[PDB]
Design a protein around this ligand. Structure first.
Ligand SMILES: [Cu+2]
Ligand SMILES: [Cu+2]
Ligand SMILES: [Zn+2]
Ligand SMILES: [Zn+2]
Lengths: 156, 156
């Protein structure tokens, strides 16, 4: 039937790791996203679903932000955004981060399904397409890919 | 469009690692599987698709063999088998292994899709459901889980 839970274990070679959990109680309902990370520089870090669930080559094969609606990069709350745009994960002074959001664009089913794709957490802050740079409207100018993982179906 | 390529990076804490690549030409056509491993004890190792793409608790969270047809465990060539049954990976004296197979039951699309699920390589040989042991018809009596990874969509 409809997928109601998913998970993503994120790793890399930068000392950053984390786990993302997703719930979707109805086939077209909002998805609850919960993430925990460690090893991050204090502050904001870009967090998005990328197109491919290919983590080989140190996250460099994950592709661009997941964008089935062919839009420019934006903030999760914006009408204009990539389906994969989940904004920023905020790390405290200790390098740990807790993230929670309810999103209506990503899904665990249908065309916006993130199952089998990648979650990526970035080196720098996602400017939400508001930075004024060319990269702002593509990547949010979030810099390098610190950790990634493929999104898998979870028990429900 | 339909998925035509997938990849799975397998890791663990047992010194074993590998990578599996999958290709599928049509939505429900056969899937070509190619896998490479290192760090294995010489001999045969059970290799299957497990139901959940969850590796938060090592490979234990991956659940049991993927079995949408609700059959007993068997060899890939058997009529009675789990969709997830891919037989054995053979490791040489150097601990390396190469595996190739074309399978008609697993898919990268539809109800038998393995996207978002987990590939697992085991400690021992899969008896293909013929060993006459308690777990023969359940897991092939392949023992522990050496390495695993979630199956992601790859660039066509
Ligand atoms: Cu990203
Ligand atoms: Cu198995
Ligand atoms: Zn984006
Ligand atoms: Zn089986």
């Amino acid at each position: 039937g409809s997928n109601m839970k998913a998970v993503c274990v994120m790793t890399g070679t930068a000392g950053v790791k984390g786990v993302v959990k997703f719930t979707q109680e109805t086939d077209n309902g909002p998805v609850h996203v919960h993430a925990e990370f460690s090893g991050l520089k204090a502050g904001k870090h870009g967090f998005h679903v990328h197109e491919f669930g290919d983590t080989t080559n140190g996250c460099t094969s994950a592709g661009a932000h997941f964008n089935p609606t062919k839009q420019e990069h934006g903030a999760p709350e914006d009408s204009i955004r990539h389906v994969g745009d989940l904004g920023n994960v905020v790390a405290g002074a200790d390098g740990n981060a807790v993230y929670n959001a309810t999103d209506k664009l990503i899904s665990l089913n249908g065309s916006h399904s993130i199952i089998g794709r990648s979650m990526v957490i970035h080196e720098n802050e996602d400017d939400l397409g508001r930075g004024g740079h060319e990269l702002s409207k593509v990547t949010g100018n979030a810099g390098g890919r610190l950790a990634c993982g493929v999104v898998g179906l979870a028990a429900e």
